[PDB]
Amino acid sequence: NTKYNKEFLLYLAGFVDGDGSIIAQIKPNQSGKFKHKLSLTFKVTQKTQRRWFLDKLVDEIGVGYVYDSGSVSNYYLSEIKPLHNFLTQLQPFLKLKQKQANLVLKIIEQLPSAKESPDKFLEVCTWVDQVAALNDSKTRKTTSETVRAVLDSL
Amino acid sequence: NTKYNKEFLLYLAGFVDSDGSIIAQIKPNQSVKFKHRLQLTFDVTQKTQRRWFLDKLVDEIGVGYVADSGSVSKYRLSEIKPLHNFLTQLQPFLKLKQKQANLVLKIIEQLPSAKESPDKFLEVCTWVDQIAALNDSKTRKTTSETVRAVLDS
DNA sequence: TCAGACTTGTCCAC
DNA sequence: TCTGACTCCTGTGG
DNA sequence: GGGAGTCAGA
DNA sequence: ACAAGTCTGA
Ligand SMILES: [Mn+2]
Ligand SMILES: [Mn+2]
Ligand SMILES: [Mn+2]
To answer: How many angstroms separate the CA of A67 from the C1' of C6?
Structure first.
């Protein structure tokens, strides 16, 4: 568990609140238990001209990746454990995306017990909904009701 | 000279590098000596839904204003004296717009000596070009060569 | 099976 | 003369 | 985000 | 920014 410098977390919080994104997703997973996979993603977006800035993040955070998609690049962290460690420390400084961060931390911690009953799983799916609500969601498909419909059919 | 909290400057520098903007503009003006005035602007942009975040920023910086147009609000500061004081403290924490900040500070310090000789004024406008060059400029019209053409008369 | 790497799309928030 | 507040718009980088 | 403009006041 | 996806390994 890496400890991060405070002045680093303070700057990063502002940048994340500006050009970053905290994402919770319910992904279709046929080869699975409830046909639905959960995905948590911390993401920092920036133009490829400044890919170096996002490259620095990989070294400073210690994990994550940088991929290209047009004229724009993104930093990408989805690995649950370093994600929980990173968001735990960044959260006290976030202003605009603090609640999304907290819901993600809360989803991660309740993740193993959500693999049990579908009821507990669907409850966690509703927490995914709230994150999308707090973001500027525009192109969302799979929600908690998309899970319930497939689950009640079973 | 209101001095700002270091933790506040660190967070703000991050938000400025992300959603902020440091703008140097060469505006035309017939009443003015060289037919062109200069304007420096610190700008933080956010949708009106989160205008409150910009409202806090005004109270925190003490100076500035929030303007609305469409679905987006904006904090702005163009008052030279408070802007110079503010950018001075904010500069060391900037990472993506640090060069823009320093150039603006450079322009401001060479401002009273720019209203003198045309050759000096052209040099200051060249600094404005660099700022637009460092930025993601896409709608710029008046450059230093525009001033050059007008100056030859 | 399943989390994690890596890609593609779109609408707007800058 | 001259500055700064204020509005509106484009074209992306988120 | 990063300009273009117009205006009232100083 | 906020999604939507594919596919490979253990
Ligand atoms: Mn933003
Ligand atoms: Mn940005
Ligand atoms: Mn942004």
So the answer is: 8
